[PDB]
Design a protein around this ligand. Sequence first.
Ligand SMILES: *[C@@H]1O[C@H](CO)[C@@H](O[C@@H]2O[C@H](CO)[C@@H](O[C@@H]3O[C@H](CO[C@H]4O[C@H](CO)[C@@H](O)[C@H](O)[C@@H]4O)[C@@H](O)[C@H](O[C@H]4O[C@H](CO)[C@@H](O)[C@H](O)[C@@H]4O[C@H]4O[C@H](CO)[C@@H](O)[C@H](O)[C@@H]4O)[C@@H]3O)[C@H](O)[C@H]2NC(C)=O)[C@H](O)[C@H]1NC(C)=O
Ligand SMILES: *[C@@H]1O[C@H](CO)[C@@H](O[C@@H]2O[C@H](CO)[C@@H](O[C@@H]3O[C@H](CO[C@H]4O[C@H](CO)[C@@H](O)[C@H](O)[C@@H]4O)[C@@H](O)[C@H](O[C@H]4O[C@H](CO)[C@@H](O)[C@H](O)[C@@H]4O[C@H]4O[C@H](CO)[C@@H](O)[C@H](O)[C@@H]4O)[C@@H]3O)[C@H](O)[C@H]2NC(C)=O)[C@H](O)[C@H]1NC(C)=O
Lengths: 359, 359
Amino acid sequence: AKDTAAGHVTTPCTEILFDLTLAKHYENQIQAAESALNRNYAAIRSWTLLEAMSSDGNRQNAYTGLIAYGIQITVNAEQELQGPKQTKLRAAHALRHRAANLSAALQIQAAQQATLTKPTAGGAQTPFSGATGTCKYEGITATAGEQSCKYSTEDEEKINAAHMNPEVMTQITTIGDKYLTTITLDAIAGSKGNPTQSSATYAEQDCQDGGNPGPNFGGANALGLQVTKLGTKATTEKTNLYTAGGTECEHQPGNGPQKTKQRLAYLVCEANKAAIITPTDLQTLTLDALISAPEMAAIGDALLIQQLLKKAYGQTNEQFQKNFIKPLAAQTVKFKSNTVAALMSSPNSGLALAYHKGK
Amino acid sequence: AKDTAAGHVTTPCTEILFDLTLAKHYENQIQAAESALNRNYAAIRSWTLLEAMSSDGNRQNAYTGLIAYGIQITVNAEQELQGPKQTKLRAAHALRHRAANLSAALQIQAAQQATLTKPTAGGAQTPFSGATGTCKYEGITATAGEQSCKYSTEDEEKINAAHMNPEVMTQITTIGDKYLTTITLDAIAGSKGNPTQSSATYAEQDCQDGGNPGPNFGGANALGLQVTKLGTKATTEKTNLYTAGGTECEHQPGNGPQKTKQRLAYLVCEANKAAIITPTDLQTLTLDALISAPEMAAIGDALLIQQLLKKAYGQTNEQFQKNFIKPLAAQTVKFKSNTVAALMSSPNSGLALAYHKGK
Ligand SMILES: *[C@@H]1O[C@H](CO)[C@@H](O[C@@H]2O[C@H](CO)[C@@H](O[C@@H]3O[C@H](CO[C@H]4O[C@H](CO)[C@@H](O)[C@H](O)[C@@H]4O)[C@@H](O)[C@H](O[C@H]4O[C@H](CO)[C@@H](O)[C@H](O)[C@@H]4O[C@H]4O[C@H](CO)[C@@H](O)[C@H](O)[C@@H]4O)[C@@H]3O)[C@H](O)[C@H]2NC(C)=O)[C@H](O)[C@H]1NC(C)=O
Ligand SMILES: *[C@@H]1O[C@H](CO)[C@@H](O[C@@H]2O[C@H](CO)[C@@H](O[C@@H]3O[C@H](CO[C@H]4O[C@H](CO)[C@@H](O)[C@H](O)[C@@H]4O)[C@@H](O)[C@H](O[C@H]4O[C@H](CO)[C@@H](O)[C@H](O)[C@@H]4O[C@H]4O[C@H](CO)[C@@H](O)[C@H](O)[C@@H]4O)[C@@H]3O)[C@H](O)[C@H]2NC(C)=O)[C@H](O)[C@H]1NC(C)=O
């Protein structure tokens, strides 16, 4: 189904959640690819130690073949990751920036009740040069308590990385810009009698004199105003990621001024298109994956073709695991103690290699 | 001198610049350390190829010693980087979040001129149950054009990574929270005559009747209000990074509610304390740096002590550079073509190794 996550964005808080969840999805895709590279480099260090520890030329050549394979695919994958990584990080950064902006706006747009100050009475004065009474208030303020976004179980289910694979995303939903830019308020003035500069009894936060000044314009003459509410209403808007044909990103930059929603849509589209390719996980390699790997044809030809690969690595995956995979975790190495893979990722890694290459 | 950069923060825009400049400084420290690691791993791949290409056992052992050294120091440095990296990224993320917040607030606090709507006249009505005239305005708004921060040459000189080494930073300066939270406005009411529900001539964005209604309360009876300005004034505040003794971070979390400035100060202090250690640059290694390296004592003992190291690597740095450093950039490798270091960081890296290990 398309757009489950964006179609649940109906409020400032749900846009925030979408933006941060999608940013974290892109960041997690990069972290997962880098973790995979680091696992592969760890495997290569482990096989380098095992090569140094074997005395059989054919077993040594087999380890060399796994080192060579590993270096080739992992160096390549690390190079190929960089473009998608930068694309995805540009979008993650922008999404986090937007979510920050919107959260800050939310706090201000929650300031919906005003505190009046004590006014000063006058007669005619700017901007009412024709008035006989004025009541002037300076520094009326509105502030809210600390706001927070509260999410339901379903909000977190629907606005979730599980719904943010590229094949399902066609649009983003954003709050209209006026929520970010505009202060909105209602206000009312009230008059009784003949208010003038002498209406200087201010106990009710208005200007009164005559009679018995008091609550609800008790006095003979009164003038006042109240700001009865503030706050701009949020609206939502939809922006397509792709052009009509569905391939190309809409909202490419450089074609004229753009709105926030259009810049975000472009970045999201490009980050969705920039798919990451992860290489094989060397630490869990199977025999069939090794001998079917395209890079192993030339590597095998150089060191030893699929017939030759089985002779070196095993006729069964059981044999392959036994000889080339299980030793990473289970084989202890002691000299003057740790298992192969942990040792070759530890502070003694290089020394372990020097020691066994020397012995 | 202390606090050149924070002492130039006097405005919202200069706080933004400080926050983003310091975030980028931390991000650049991490990028520089990772670049250094990647250069070292590239050198290790290069020496692995040269080991495979030599036929002299003693030259082979020498390359093995550089591989072992490189692995040890680079794996260690990569492990040791992770804690400081995470600390520095927590601060960079928070600084960028703050700068976003403040930029969003700046846009709203620039909305300083109101647009009045056409009012509706009444008599007594809430919140003026004692009035004889009211003039009620709904949806008064204030919006600014797109704001931007403009920096002088000196702003960029003083609020600069060159002034953000830890030894010079004792405090941060931040805008007061009210700029982020509070709407401020001035407003004035004006009255003439006996305004009532019949004061329903609205051409001047006030309530008039009687006589000849017009500009400046031309009519006999008038009531109106104007919002004459909006905007909350920025203030600045200083927060110390360290406790009085100067070692420990002030504002540790977990001791009670904190303000934004205190959370930021804590994160900045921890990111400043979490110094990164970069290992030696293997691609520009000198002979004296190699034989003075502590790790080379055991590695040399294992493969070959400083006397033995000079026998393997050269009695002069000229000889060392000739035999072990210059070949990385200058030695061409061809088989069925590239220089050593570029080849071992290219898509043919592993195959180049397999080819020469087989030949
Ligand atoms: C989070 O919220 C913040 C706060 O509101 C918001 O920040 C604002 O971002 C906008 C968009 O980036 C910033 O506006 C940019 O401002 C610069 C600088 O303008 C000043 O300085 C230049 C001199 O360098 C003067 O020319 C100018 O008069 C100002 O004094 C502009 O250079 C940017 O221009 C481009 O975009 C404009 C529309 O936004 C166009 O009108 C303009 O022509 C430019 O577009 C063209 O060039 C683009 C680049 O080549 C191109 O891609 C376009 O297609 C087109 O060809 C722009 O005006 C604004 O200053 C920020 N405000 C503050 C207070 O920081 C964040 O955007 C928001 N973030 C998210 C992700 O939601
Ligand atoms: C950019 O601008 C944004 C927008 O203003 C701003 O976001 C706001 O950040 C604050 C600070 O993080 C957020 O406040 C936090 O809100 C949570 C959630 O509160 C709700 O939900 C909980 C249930 O989980 C309810 O209990 C609660 O009643 C609310 O309904 C709170 O859990 C956080 O509490 C800690 O900090 C408070 C003070 O801020 C304390 O009063 C509270 O006791 C907690 O502190 C204690 O626990 C801490 C953690 O263990 C500990 O370190 C302390 O020392 C202490 O022991 C907090 O209230 C707020 O919701 C965000 N607003 C929105 C709209 O997103 C960003 O902070 C700002 N960023 C930057 C970097 O400038």
